[PDB]
């Protein structure tokens, strides 16, 4: 129960209490991963549900923006599981206030950059330190970062959100190179329009946009769509595809005229 | 009717296409192998992987023959669930663009781009008319990192593969409502007969760090990726491009 | 012996549309002009001569690659050298419709002109440029592709493919010509008011008015000409390999 | 009503920003120059070109000072026609990503990305409040090929520049109806203070052909490009990115 040769691979999913992160966690548990979930607060019903899929599941309280606590969080994961095979950088937030770029406030820019970009980058640094020190490597290893189609499609009413995600796109490319000899597959997943709490406030507009054809596959994405994709990348069949970006968007980001 | 999904793999007799065929067989697909060259010994070996396999002789460039080939695949299997556009050829000559000959440009374009486009058309006609759709469906097109990394000594090849990149995007839109996942796979430096003549120069480059993973790609690397996409988990990712290159195409300074 | 005193631009498909807007802009900047096209418009040539330089017409089918060497030699005989090549000649898809109905012969027609023809015409011109004994002016090759290189239209994939092939060609051409200090650029027009767009004016009208084009207007041939003339003047030599979108923002990916 | 257009060039006391300022002055612009520390001499160098030149002390990272800086510019010149976002800094330390310090990440992000974004915000407010628009208007942002080419030993620098790429795209949409051309310029390897400590590595790479044009870039190369875009001929190309790199960022195999 301390220092836990492991029989199952270990995925660390940030922001895994709900939404896309929970869909990812369910998919990884179904493919046979033990789960270390982080989030700002716990949901005991969630942990129970995930435990009903047959694997080991533990929750770790963490503010992704609090970079000074990341090393301790990674220590807690290692003490509970012995190693980390898959990191899913999922936790993130939308813009504090959508509106004219001329009204964008620096405090709001800072909040979202601190979480989505700065927090993700140094949480990844803390985990990679542990992965590179792993004495044994018996499972495929991956780092999957949930960015957004907003990395490559701009929304002028929330340029702080777009900038933070585009920064992740750049970070993934460099991280892939840094981890290539360690045989850690490094991938970017760009969700489009997914049914979660982050899109609930804009749900009516996105409804009509989806009926109008904005999304070529003409439906909302589900957290289980992103989860199936992430679990596919974490299984090891895509190791030689390190550096690839996957668009989990039903074709939304296909440029068309 | 059919109880196992059917993959049609062009150029599936050897190299990357054979790696893809093996990986799809392990994933539970029956196999329609097409190629302009026959090798029944390879077909026999594929049958050892547990599924049904049939071979169809086809020249990818001979677009007037594609309809009959697709009809023959339908006759044998009743339907097509996955198309892998793998058949292709390298440049006839490598050398100064100033010496590029239009006949050699034509040979490569007729196979890699024109042939792939209209062979895909013939298969899509069949897929859109499927009575039953019981398995995930996909069209996976093997282009190359040469779609996005230029080689001035073989611009005809690079152009043919860049054309495939554009075709894939439009095809994904056309087939989105039919729920056929449409993907591009860009192999980097893979150990096949296509790289055989330059195998010593690439051996040197791979060691020197040109490929961040510092190894040859294998047909089985591309096969595992293609089989991952064909299983259905990536349907909502239609239009995606996957680099099967150990990091080769990551732009770095 | 005394080399030419004005730079020479060869503009393919320069009889009308974007090619003519490019020709007018280059003539105003002091370029002599070698215009190629399938048919001549003598009134156009006279109009271009009104700007004060030498203008000469050369009948050429861009798809007829066996004739390109003779065309280039005829330009050299008349002008002594080529400083700027504008690859502008091109055609729209023969028929817009479902990809399932696309015909190989129509695919070939578009590919033979837009892609194959452009590539080997460029090859013929580059042979001449690399043999030039004197280089007194900035040199460039500017290729008019399209936003369709990077924005797909499933009802005319042959056209998109032909232009996406040009994008790849321009990147390798820029590498081949970097030591010769020939600036190689791609220009991607968006929706421009020419005979190529006249049949779909109604649909583009509404897209434009609705802000699909962020600048909310049709492009004109003079918009592309101003951009091309800017590139041909030499200030962009160190930007070789760059692509310019002449589209009022159309191709900015937005959500 | 002012009779010459006014360009505001950040970080314009040396290097690329000074080359841009020189190029704009030669094209008939008056110049408002900023930099962190005072400079009495750059005015006299630029004044030889015949226009009006003024220097303004401004820390680009100090967003609360930006409003006063812009007002000081308006007081001296009446309006701003062209903004060149040139000020920036390289990574505080190069080294393994594993050792990247958050404080150094913050310093570079505060200047290159956050500072640029909110200084543009302040300047744009002035431009949209203009009574008179007699000259072509533009905003040219100097990012880097590091926006699109990764350097794992300085990922903070790359991320800050990639953020600018996204910013410029959204800014171009925001200003499209105001007829303000919005452009990104990506320098490659330019001979300035910023490359001085790695000039030996870059000499070997440049001579080896990493840069296809096989020479160092100079401040006047970027300046000629930026002045080209500021002249109005590229207004219908708003949103375009120009690579000022001698072909460095052309992806090649
Ligand atoms: N939902 C979409 O349509 C969509 C589209 C593109 C990208 N994304 C990205 O997907 C990811 C998941 O978002 P979602 O849609 O599931 O939203 P969500 O709000 O439903 O779930 C996000 C989870 O992350 C947690 N989280 C947020 N900030 C955190 C912090 N500072 N520390 C720790 N945990 C934190 C939240 O508490 C929550 O449990 C985000 O990165 C988001 O930007 C979502
Ligand atoms: N090997 C690499 O490093 C590499 C890299 C990037 C892309 N690719 C692409 O991968 C694909 C497979 O190539 P490979 O490396 O396995 O080479 P390969 O030559 O070993 O195999 C190609 C197969 O396709 C068949 N084929 C060729 N021309 C054909 C035609 N006209 N009609 C029908 N079948 C035809 C051949 O008979 C052979 O069985 C090609 O599209 C190639 O361009 C290869
Ligand atoms: N109009 C637009 O909105 C738009 C957008 C993007 C790209 N383009 C491209 O701009 C270029 C110019 O087109 P345009 O809009 O001016 O159309 P256009 O039809 O008005 O003019 C094209 C000119 O090229 C000539 N030409 C065509 N095929 C030729 C051939 N085989 N050989 C020689 N000359 C030939 C024609 O005779 C004509 O004079 C083309 O490459 C086109 O694809 C146009
Ligand atoms: N030199 C290259 O090879 C290269 C390549 C790509 C991009 N760039 C970019 O070009 C721009 C100019 O850099 P350079 O090469 O001329 O280097 P430089 O150091 O010589 O010039 C940058 C100037 O900006 C000033 N500056 C820095 N931080 C500032 C701040 N907070 N507020 C105000 N002024 C500030 C510096 O004092 C200096 O005068 C930078 O954005 C740099 O990132 C340079």
PDB file of N, CA and C in Angstrom, chain C residues 39-75:
ATOM      1  N   UNK C  39      -5.483  33.074 -76.094  1.00  0.00           N
ATOM      2  CA  UNK C  39      -5.887  33.992 -77.144  1.00  0.00           C
ATOM      3  C   UNK C  39      -5.405  35.374 -76.757  1.00  0.00           C
ATOM      4  N   UNK C  40      -5.187  36.224 -77.749  1.00  0.00           N
ATOM      5  CA  UNK C  40      -4.783  37.575 -77.410  1.00  0.00           C
ATOM      6  C   UNK C  40      -5.991  38.492 -77.376  1.00  0.00           C
ATOM      7  N   UNK C  41      -5.839  39.573 -76.624  1.00  0.00           N
ATOM      8  CA  UNK C  41      -6.761  40.699 -76.629  1.00  0.00           C
ATOM      9  C   UNK C  41      -5.858  41.872 -76.982  1.00  0.00           C
ATOM     10  N   UNK C  42      -5.843  42.237 -78.262  1.00  0.00           N
ATOM     11  CA  UNK C  42      -4.938  43.283 -78.714  1.00  0.00           C
ATOM     12  C   UNK C  42      -5.244  44.613 -78.037  1.00  0.00           C
ATOM     13  N   UNK C  43      -6.520  44.883 -77.740  1.00  0.00           N
ATOM     14  CA  UNK C  43      -6.869  46.107 -77.029  1.00  0.00           C
ATOM     15  C   UNK C  43      -6.217  46.146 -75.654  1.00  0.00           C
ATOM     16  N   UNK C  44      -6.134  44.992 -74.994  1.00  0.00           N
ATOM     17  CA  UNK C  44      -5.462  44.902 -73.701  1.00  0.00           C
ATOM     18  C   UNK C  44      -3.978  45.223 -73.845  1.00  0.00           C
ATOM     19  N   UNK C  45      -3.329  44.668 -74.873  1.00  0.00           N
ATOM     20  CA  UNK C  45      -1.902  44.924 -75.069  1.00  0.00           C
ATOM     21  C   UNK C  45      -1.655  46.415 -75.297  1.00  0.00           C
ATOM     22  N   UNK C  46      -2.466  47.029 -76.161  1.00  0.00           N
ATOM     23  CA  UNK C  46      -2.351  48.465 -76.401  1.00  0.00           C
ATOM     24  C   UNK C  46      -2.553  49.259 -75.114  1.00  0.00           C
ATOM     25  N   UNK C  47      -3.519  48.849 -74.295  1.00  0.00           N
ATOM     26  CA  UNK C  47      -3.759  49.526 -73.028  1.00  0.00           C
ATOM     27  C   UNK C  47      -2.539  49.433 -72.120  1.00  0.00           C
ATOM     28  N   UNK C  48      -1.951  48.241 -72.017  1.00  0.00           N
ATOM     29  CA  UNK C  48      -0.752  48.078 -71.201  1.00  0.00           C
ATOM     30  C   UNK C  48       0.402  48.914 -71.744  1.00  0.00           C
ATOM     31  N   UNK C  49       0.521  49.013 -73.069  1.00  0.00           N
ATOM     32  CA  UNK C  49       1.565  49.848 -73.640  1.00  0.00           C
ATOM     33  C   UNK C  49       1.358  51.313 -73.308  1.00  0.00           C
ATOM     34  N   UNK C  50       0.116  51.706 -73.011  1.00  0.00           N
ATOM     35  CA  UNK C  50      -0.159  53.065 -72.595  1.00  0.00           C
ATOM     36  C   UNK C  50       0.576  53.469 -71.337  1.00  0.00           C
ATOM     37  N   UNK C  51       1.070  52.503 -70.563  1.00  0.00           N
ATOM     38  CA  UNK C  51       1.811  52.793 -69.345  1.00  0.00           C
ATOM     39  C   UNK C  51       3.297  53.058 -69.587  1.00  0.00           C
ATOM     40  N   UNK C  52       3.773  52.965 -70.829  1.00  0.00           N
ATOM     41  CA  UNK C  52       5.071  53.496 -71.192  1.00  0.00           C
ATOM     42  C   UNK C  52       6.204  52.505 -71.384  1.00  0.00           C
ATOM     43  N   UNK C  53       5.989  51.212 -71.153  1.00  0.00           N
ATOM     44  CA  UNK C  53       7.029  50.218 -71.289  1.00  0.00           C
ATOM     45  C   UNK C  53       6.807  49.322 -72.498  1.00  0.00           C
ATOM     46  N   UNK C  54       7.725  48.373 -72.671  1.00  0.00           N
ATOM     47  CA  UNK C  54       7.558  47.353 -73.696  1.00  0.00           C
ATOM     48  C   UNK C  54       6.572  46.296 -73.214  1.00  0.00           C
ATOM     49  N   UNK C  55       5.658  45.899 -74.107  1.00  0.00           N
ATOM     50  CA  UNK C  55       4.677  44.839 -73.867  1.00  0.00           C
ATOM     51  C   UNK C  55       4.609  43.984 -75.123  1.00  0.00           C
ATOM     52  N   UNK C  56       4.727  42.666 -74.967  1.00  0.00           N
ATOM     53  CA  UNK C  56       4.634  41.756 -76.106  1.00  0.00           C
ATOM     54  C   UNK C  56       3.815  40.536 -75.718  1.00  0.00           C
ATOM     55  N   UNK C  57       3.053  40.015 -76.674  1.00  0.00           N
ATOM     56  CA  UNK C  57       2.177  38.879 -76.417  1.00  0.00           C
ATOM     57  C   UNK C  57       2.748  37.594 -77.012  1.00  0.00           C
ATOM     58  N   UNK C  58       2.586  36.484 -76.276  1.00  0.00           N
ATOM     59  CA  UNK C  58       3.054  35.165 -76.696  1.00  0.00           C
ATOM     60  C   UNK C  58       1.926  34.162 -76.503  1.00  0.00           C
ATOM     61  N   UNK C  59       1.438  33.620 -77.615  1.00  0.00           N
ATOM     62  CA  UNK C  59       0.386  32.616 -77.593  1.00  0.00           C
ATOM     63  C   UNK C  59       0.929  31.344 -76.963  1.00  0.00           C
ATOM     64  N   UNK C  60       0.232  30.833 -75.951  1.00  0.00           N
ATOM     65  CA  UNK C  60       0.705  29.648 -75.243  1.00  0.00           C
ATOM     66  C   UNK C  60      -0.467  28.955 -74.567  1.00  0.00           C
ATOM     67  N   UNK C  61      -0.555  27.639 -74.748  1.00  0.00           N
ATOM     68  CA  UNK C  61      -1.403  26.788 -73.920  1.00  0.00           C
ATOM     69  C   UNK C  61      -0.520  26.232 -72.808  1.00  0.00           C
ATOM     70  N   UNK C  62      -0.760  26.685 -71.575  1.00  0.00           N
ATOM     71  CA  UNK C  62       0.028  26.227 -70.429  1.00  0.00           C
ATOM     72  C   UNK C  62       0.067  24.699 -70.335  1.00  0.00           C
ATOM     73  N   UNK C  63      -0.999  24.019 -70.745  1.00  0.00           N
ATOM     74  CA  UNK C  63      -1.003  22.557 -70.658  1.00  0.00           C
ATOM     75  C   UNK C  63      -0.065  21.889 -71.666  1.00  0.00           C
ATOM     76  N   UNK C  64       0.351  22.595 -72.727  1.00  0.00           N
ATOM     77  CA  UNK C  64       1.130  21.979 -73.803  1.00  0.00           C
ATOM     78  C   UNK C  64       2.618  22.095 -73.476  1.00  0.00           C
ATOM     79  N   UNK C  65       3.089  21.195 -72.604  1.00  0.00           N
ATOM     80  CA  UNK C  65       4.423  21.364 -72.033  1.00  0.00           C
ATOM     81  C   UNK C  65       5.508  21.244 -73.100  1.00  0.00           C
ATOM     82  N   UNK C  66       5.243  20.546 -74.215  1.00  0.00           N
ATOM     83  CA  UNK C  66       6.233  20.454 -75.279  1.00  0.00           C
ATOM     84  C   UNK C  66       6.511  21.797 -75.938  1.00  0.00           C
ATOM     85  N   UNK C  67       5.623  22.777 -75.766  1.00  0.00           N
ATOM     86  CA  UNK C  67       5.787  24.074 -76.404  1.00  0.00           C
ATOM     87  C   UNK C  67       6.420  25.113 -75.478  1.00  0.00           C
ATOM     88  N   UNK C  68       6.692  24.769 -74.211  1.00  0.00           N
ATOM     89  CA  UNK C  68       7.133  25.784 -73.245  1.00  0.00           C
ATOM     90  C   UNK C  68       8.537  26.295 -73.542  1.00  0.00           C
ATOM     91  N   UNK C  69       9.450  25.406 -73.935  1.00  0.00           N
ATOM     92  CA  UNK C  69      10.809  25.838 -74.248  1.00  0.00           C
ATOM     93  C   UNK C  69      10.820  26.892 -75.354  1.00  0.00           C
ATOM     94  N   UNK C  70      10.032  26.673 -76.410  1.00  0.00           N
ATOM     95  CA  UNK C  70       9.981  27.628 -77.512  1.00  0.00           C
ATOM     96  C   UNK C  70       9.387  28.959 -77.066  1.00  0.00           C
ATOM     97  N   UNK C  71       8.381  28.922 -76.197  1.00  0.00           N
ATOM     98  CA  UNK C  71       7.814  30.155 -75.661  1.00  0.00           C
ATOM     99  C   UNK C  71       8.861  30.930 -74.876  1.00  0.00           C
ATOM    100  N   UNK C  72       9.593  30.240 -73.998  1.00  0.00           N
ATOM    101  CA  UNK C  72      10.595  30.928 -73.187  1.00  0.00           C
ATOM    102  C   UNK C  72      11.696  31.524 -74.066  1.00  0.00           C
ATOM    103  N   UNK C  73      12.160  30.778 -75.074  1.00  0.00           N
ATOM    104  CA  UNK C  73      13.161  31.335 -75.990  1.00  0.00           C
ATOM    105  C   UNK C  73      12.630  32.553 -76.734  1.00  0.00           C
ATOM    106  N   UNK C  74      11.351  32.536 -77.111  1.00  0.00           N
ATOM    107  CA  UNK C  74      10.785  33.705 -77.776  1.00  0.00           C
ATOM    108  C   UNK C  74      10.765  34.917 -76.848  1.00  0.00           C
ATOM    109  N   UNK C  75      10.491  34.709 -75.553  1.00  0.00           N
ATOM    110  CA  UNK C  75      10.540  35.824 -74.607  1.00  0.00           C
ATOM    111  C   UNK C  75      11.966  36.350 -74.469  1.00  0.00           C
TER     112      UNK C  75
END
